[PDB]
């Protein structure tokens, strides 16, 4: 489980090769990948920029068009803990990443 600290940002890595996958859309969602995928969406990109976001705390601060679609959750709270899913819609070879985030109250 990725460890986070309340009051600080936390980043969940999600990266893919655009050389082999092309520049494609991706989404982040709350929940485990096989039970929700992106039904409870946090982020949607069109491959180049974020086109949908649940709220401003969910940011893609990396170079999106170069494959870095890692999610940074700003100003985390213990309540942000839980499962997260990244889905990169690479035609014919979707990439999935499951994370269990644990944000500690202090430390």
């Amino acid at each position: 489980a990725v460890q986070g600290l309340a009051g600080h940002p936390v980043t969940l890595p999600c990266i893919y090769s655009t050389h082999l996958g092309g520049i494609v859309p991706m989404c982040w969602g709350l929940g485990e990948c096989r039970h929700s995928y992106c039904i409870r969406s946090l982020i949607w990109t069109n491959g180049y920029t974020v086109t949908h976001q649940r709220n401003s705390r969910y940011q893609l601060k990396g170079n999106i068009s170069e494959g870095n679609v890692s999610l940074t959750i700003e100003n985390t709270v213990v309540g942000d803990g839980g499962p997260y899913c990244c889905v990169v819609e690479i035609p014919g070879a979707f990439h999935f990443v499951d994370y269990m985030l644990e944000v500690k109250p202090e430390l």
Side-chain angles (χ1 to χ4, degrees):
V2 176
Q3 302 293 305
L5 181 59
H8 297 67
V10 67
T11 296
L12 302 181
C14 195
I15 309 171
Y16 73 103
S17 169
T18 53
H19 187 61
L20 297 185
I23 300 175
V24 303
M26 75 77 61
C27 61
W28 271 98
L30 291 167
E32 309 177 316
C33 289
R34 41 78 177 181
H35 74 60
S36 298
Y37 295 83
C38 293
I39 297 175
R40 302 155 60 195
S41 67
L42 293 172
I43 293 289
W44 268 102
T45 73
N46 67 351
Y48 301 79
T49 199
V50 171
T51 54
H52 298 83
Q53 65 186 42
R54 179 171 291 273
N55 68 49
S56 302
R57 287 203 304 130
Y58 302 102
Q59 296 284 318
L60 264 55
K61 309 185 74 173
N63 192 330
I64 297 174
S65 60
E66 297 213 353
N68 185 0
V69 290
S70 301
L71 170 68
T72 295
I73 299 175
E74 306 286 1
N75 197 37
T76 66
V77 285
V78 292
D80 286 320
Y84 289 75
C85 173
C86 178
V87 183
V88 185
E89 305 191 309
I90 299 165
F94 279 32
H95 168 46
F96 295 94
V97 186
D98 270 297
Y99 283 114
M100 184 55 63
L101 174 67
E102 171 178 52
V103 177
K104 298 297 184 177
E106 65 182 348
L107 299 214

